[PDB]
DNA sequence: CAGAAATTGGCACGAAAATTGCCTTAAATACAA
DNA sequence: TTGTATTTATTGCAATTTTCGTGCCAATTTCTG
């Protein structure tokens, strides 16, 4: 259902405290969505993110809303689908934040 | 033949690589060899078309389901303002069983009258009809243009003006004013809110003019260069035996080899570019249509190399002339015969054909025969089929599809 | 008026609708602070 | 998106401070990984560390 | 400055705490009227899909917005511009798009000139007005000068 | 009205041009017997 | 004295694929009697 999907991304988390502590390596690996292996940012030939780079698109998310990187899955009817050709999920481009 | 060892084949393979790929490949060899080294704001949110459409969707008294449908409809709108998916894909993206296509059409007809008008239109006919409906009823030629937009648009597409007069029962006076009114419409309504920047290419070779003669040199910004790490080279002389010295020796050897192979690529590129720009000084002085028909065997006769080397070097490397940026393979072209025993390049015949077509009588366009005969008075000797091939390479419609009133 | 991304649009829509009421939400520059603090190897989090 | 590249006129994506500091670390880490795989002499690996 | 016939006295609080009360003849005689001159620039660069060109026929705009542009696409000297008027008509090329039947239908009816070109023309900023008094054209050596230059 | 002249492009020719995978060692040199 | 392990020097050939211009001819437009 699209109505619930759209309604469930504007909600505000409720809390009453802020806790600070030390970060375990397992905690850091739990935060991450992938490992950065190469120091290149932008291709400069297609002006697209380079794989396993600082500005990568499989680790950090799509560059366009509900649009995969290679271009197989491109619309909102495919939301949540992880492409099998490049591993990019199709969601909002704000998840890069 | 030549005894090909897999260390010479890597030096040969280094030629057919662009500067970006060459710098990408140099990093891998840099991080696998200790003795190698290299010598060396927040932003602003712009408003696109979809953001503008959403700003109006949120301010329109929709319902909870209508707004969800409008989100899908606005999402499937490209930068030209045309709906890129059928409504059956939007009804599927909603993911609800009770919603029918009638509601989707009702929401689409409301989204289609946003700013700009005609946005999110299925095709050109719908996009023109939407704009034609917003005009005041007391408008000249409104019904006459609407009739041919709604019924006979293929005839106007093929410039079949004769058939339009018969089917629409119209004279010359109205069939020109109505068509002018149609051309007054906006074909792409979504390009009003257009945001973006073009993409640039940093050249490899720079050619300029100095003291009346052309000078050529490699672009010093993008040229790749490596260096030997002296601190590790100072450890060669028996810091410790066996590995401690053998490793440094066997890596210094390969670093020297790689640096030599990079210099042997830069020099070859520079010499090939200098020969190329020396053989076609006519092109840079007075633009196109004066370019000579040269091939690989012509270049691999003054620099004294093999044709396969010239083939590899000129791959994906750009040259910056005062005219513009070129591929450095754009200068190798075919040829056709000429009066006087000479030859004329295809890249000049294309410019001549473009110039002749861009100056014909609009009422009576020139056909391929009328271009072949016109060219065969300067002694160009081109067959009609070759002229047709050149025109279709230039993406120019045939003569019967260029006439107009 | 400054930072809550999802509250700006709601406030604008309510003002245009003749209803002067806001849903406060959370500023977007404290999430940046959390992401920059926890990229130093320090586990800071909101709880409950 | 919290460390974006700066687009200035001319097609130039100048690398910011944080991206430079990340690229330096990634280069050193990759070099150290390769050297540890190659079984390099301890002097070079100590300098790399 | 200017010589003003001044008087020292309180006048109903309109010169309270360093304020100044000015007559209407000072405004009628244009004694403190000044002239301010502001410059704007339009640069045509070289892209990979061909170069940008300065032209007087922008595809999407109407015939009114091009009323004060000459044959070379540059505003007339002496024209009173305001708001978002077009000063220099500049077009950047978009290309390398594969043809489709809808794209062919769009290109046939409205002509090939409208397609494959964008609009990057220079326009007056918002809230800026004045009169065009000087136009300067700098052309790189090798490029062919237009009629204005 | 309608047959004929004109136009257009898919498909087919030989020849030329451009690519791509390899001979995956021979000769000069310093050292040892 | 010579035989040999060591170290340079070597950025081309020759098949194989692709592209070239131009003729044949069927399908679609235009034109004059
Ligand atoms: Zn993909």
Three state DSSP letters for chain B? CCCCCCCHHHHHHCCCCCHHHHHHHHHHHHHCCCCEECCCCCCCCCCCHHHHHHHHHCCCCCCHHHHHHHHHHHHCECCCCEECCCHHHHHHHHCCCCCCHHHHHHHHHHHCCCCCCCCCECCHHHHHHHHHHHCCCCCCCHHHHHHHHHCCCHHHHCCCHHHHHHHHCCCHHHHHHHHHHHHCCCCCHHHCCCCCCCCCCCCCEEEEEECCEEEEEECCCCCCCCEECHHHHCCCCCCCCCHHHHHHHHHHHHHHHHHHHHHHHHHHHHHHHHHHHHHCHHHHHCCCCCCCCECHHHHCCCCCCCHHHHHHHCCCCCEECCCCEECCCCCECCEEECCCCCEEEHHHHHHHHHHHHCCCCCCCCCCHHHHHHHHCCCCCCCCHHHHHHHHHHCCCCCHHHCCCC
Contact E86, E142 (CB under 8 A): no
Contact B251, B34 (CB under 8 A): yes
* Alpha carbon distance B155, B151 (integer Å): 10
As a rounded value in angstroms, the CA-to-C1' distance for B283 and G21 is 24
Would the annotation count A68 as a binding residue? yes
Residue E23 lies in a domain: no
Residue E11 lies in a domain: no
Q: How far is CA B102 from CA B87, B119, E123, in A?
A: 10, 19, 44
Would the annotation count A70 as a binding residue? yes
Those residues whose C-beta lies under 8 Å from the C-beta of residue B246, and which sit 6 or more positions away, are none
**Cross-chain Cβ contact E108/B157 below 8 Å:** yes
Phi, psi angle pair for C11, to nearest 5°: -65, -45
Q: How far is CA A3 from CA B63, B76, D42, in A?
A: 11, 17, 62
* Alpha carbon distance A14, A1 (integer Å): 25
Q: Give the CB-side neighbour count of residue B185, counting CA atoms within 13 A.
A: 29
Contact B366, B354 (CB under 8 A): no
* Alpha carbon distance B325, B219 (integer Å): 13
Residue E47 belongs to what domain range?
34-149
* Alpha carbon distance B132, A96 (integer Å): 43
Taking the centre of ligand 1 as the mean of its atom positions, its distance from the CA of residue B313, in whole angstroms, is 33
Q: How far is CA B50 from CA B56, B70, B150, B193, in A?
A: 10, 11, 28, 9
* Alpha carbon distance B204, B222 (integer Å): 7
Return positions of chain G under 7 A from a protein CB.
8-14, 20-24, 29-30
Q: Is the CB of B400 under 7 A from strand G?
A: yes
Count up the domains in chain E and report the number: 1
Q: How far is CA D22 from CA A62, B342, D16, in A?
A: 21, 61, 10
Nearest to A39 among D5, D13, D23 (CB): D23
Contact E105, E112 (CB under 8 A): no
Q: Is the CB of B303 under 7 A from strand G?
A: no
Q: For B251-284, give one letter per residue: b (16+ CB within 10 A) or e.
A: bbeebeebeebbeebeebbbbbbbbbbeebeebb
* HEC-encoded secondary structure of B218-267: ECCCCCCCCEECHHHHCCCCCCCCCHHHHHHHHHHHHHHHHHHHHHHHHH
Nearest to E110 among B158, B187, B199 (CB): B187
Residue E147 lies in a domain: yes
Q: Is the CB of B334 under 7 A from strand G?
A: yes
As a rounded value in angstroms, the CA-to-C1' distance for B157 and F6 is 22
Residue E12 lies in a domain: no
Phi-psi region of B350 (alpha: psi -120 to 50; beta: other; left: phi over 0): alpha
The resolution in angstroms reads: 3.0
Residue E91 lies in a domain: yes
Would the annotation count A56 as a binding residue? no
Any idea what DSSP says for residue A49?
Answer: B
**Cross-chain Cβ contact A17/C41 below 8 Å:** no
Experimental method reported for this structure: cryo-EM
As a rounded value in angstroms, the CA-to-C1' distance for B215 and F28 is 41
**Cross-chain Cβ contact E108/B191 below 8 Å:** no
Residue E70 lies in a domain: yes
CA E15 vs. chain centroid, Å, equals 41
Residue E18 lies in a domain: no
Residue with tokens 């003669």: B213
CATH number at residue E146: 2.40.50.150
* Alpha carbon distance B81, B187 (integer Å): 10
Those residues whose C-beta lies under 8 Å from the C-beta of residue B105, and which sit 6 or more positions away, are B87
Give the A-side interface with D, CB within 8 Å: 36-39, 41-42, 44, 54-55, 94, 96-97
Q: How far is CA E98 from CA B136, E109, E116, in A?
A: 38, 18, 11
Residue with tokens 């005839």: B155
């Amino acid at each position: 259902d699209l109505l619930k999907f759209l309604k469930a991304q504007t909600k505000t988390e409720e809390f009453d405290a802020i806790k600070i502590a030390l970060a375990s390596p397992d905690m850091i690996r739990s935060w991450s969505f992938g490992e950065v292996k190469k120091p290149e940012t932008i291709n400069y030939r297609t002006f697209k993110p380079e794989r396993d780079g600082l500005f990568c698109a499989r680790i950090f998310g799509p560059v366009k809303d509900y649009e995969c990187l290679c271009g197989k899955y491109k619309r909102l009817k495919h939301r949540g689908v992880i492409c099998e050709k490049c591993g990019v999920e199709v969601t909002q481009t704000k998840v890069r934040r | 033949q030549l005894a090909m060892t897999p260390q010479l084949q890597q030096a040969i393979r280094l030629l057919q690589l662009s500067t970006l790929e060459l710098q990408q490949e140099l990093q891998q060899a840099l991080e696998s060899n200790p003795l190698l080294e290299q010598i060396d704001y927040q932003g602003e949110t712009t408003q696109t078309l979809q953001d503008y459409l959403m700003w109006q969707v949120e301010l329109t008294p929709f319902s909870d389901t209508d707004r969800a449908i409008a989100t899908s409809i606005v999402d499937a709108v490209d930068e030209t303002g045309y709906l890129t998916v059928p409504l059956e894909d939007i009804l599927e993206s909603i993911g609800d069983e009770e919603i029918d296509i009638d509601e989707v059409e009702a929401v689409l007809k409301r989204i289609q009258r946003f700013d700009p008008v005609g946005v999110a239109a299925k095709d050109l006919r719908d996009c023109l009809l939407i704009q034609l409906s917003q005009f005041d009823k007391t408008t000249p030629w409104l019904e006459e243009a609407r009739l041919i937009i709604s019924d006979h648009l293929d005839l106007l597409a093929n410039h079949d003006f004769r058939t339009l007069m018969r089917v629409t029962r119209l004279k010359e006076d109205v069939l020109k004013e109505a068509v002018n009114l149609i051309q007054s419409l906006d074909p792409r309504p979504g390009q009003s809110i257009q945001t973006g920047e073009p993409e640039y290419v940093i050249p490899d070779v720079l050619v300029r003019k100095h003291n009346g003669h052309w000078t050529v040199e490699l672009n010093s910004d993008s040229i790749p260069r490596l260096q030997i790490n002296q601190h590790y080279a100072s450890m060669c002389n028996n810091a410790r035996n066996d590995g401690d010295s053998q490793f440094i020796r066997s890596n210094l050897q390969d670093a020297k080899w790689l640096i030599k192979s990079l210099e042997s690529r830069n020099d070859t590129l520079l010499r090939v570019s200098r020969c190329i720009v020396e053989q076609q000084q006519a092109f840079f002085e007075q633009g196109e249509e004066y370019m000579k028909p040269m091939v690989l065997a012509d270049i691999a006769q003054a620099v004294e190399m093999h044709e396969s080397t010239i083939s590899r070097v000129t791959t994906q490397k750009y040259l910056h002339s005062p005219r513009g940026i070129f591929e450095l393979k754009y200068f190798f072209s075919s040829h056709v015969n000429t009066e006087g025993g000479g030859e004329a390049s295809s890249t000049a015949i294309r410019a001549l054909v473009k110039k002749l077509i861009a100056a014909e009588n609009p009422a009576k366009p020139l056909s391929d025969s009328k271009l072949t005969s016109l060219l065969s008075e300067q002694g160009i000797m081109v067959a009609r089929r070759t002229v047709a091939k050149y025109r279709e390479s230039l993406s120019i419609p045939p003569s019967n599809q260029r006439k107009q009133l | 008026k400054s930072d809550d991304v999802n509250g700006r649009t709601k406030m604008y829509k309510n003002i245009v609708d003749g209803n002067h009421q806001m849903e406060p939400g959370m500023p977007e520059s404290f999430n940046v602070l959390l992401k920059e603090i926890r990229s130093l190897g320090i586990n800071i989090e909101l709880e409950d | 998106d919290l460390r974006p590249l700066v687009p200035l006129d001319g097609g130039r994506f100048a690398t910011s401070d944080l991206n430079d500091l990340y690229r330096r670390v990634i280069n050193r880490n990759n070099r150290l990984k390769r050297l540890l795989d190659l079984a390099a002499p301890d002097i070079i690996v100590r300098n790399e560390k | 400055g200017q010589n003003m016939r001044v008087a020292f006295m309180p006048w109903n609080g309109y010169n309270f705490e360093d304020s100044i009360l000015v007559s209407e003849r000072v405004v009628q005689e244009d004694r403190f009227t000044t002239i301010h001159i502001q410059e704007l620039a339009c640069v045509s660069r070289d892209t990979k899909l061909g170069p940008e060109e300065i032209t007087a026929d922008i595809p999407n705009v109407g015939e009114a917005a091009l009323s004060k542009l000459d044959e070379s696409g540059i505003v007339y000297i002496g024209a009173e511009v305001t708001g978002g008027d077009i000063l220099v008509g500049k077009v950047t090329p978009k290309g390398e798009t594969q043809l489709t039947p809808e794209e062919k239908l769009l290109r046939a009816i409205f002509g090939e000139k409208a397609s494959d070109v964008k609009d990057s023309s220079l326009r007056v900023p918002n809230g800026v007005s004045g009169t065009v008094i000087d136009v300067q054209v700098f052309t790189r050596d090798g490029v062919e000068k237009d009629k204005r230059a």
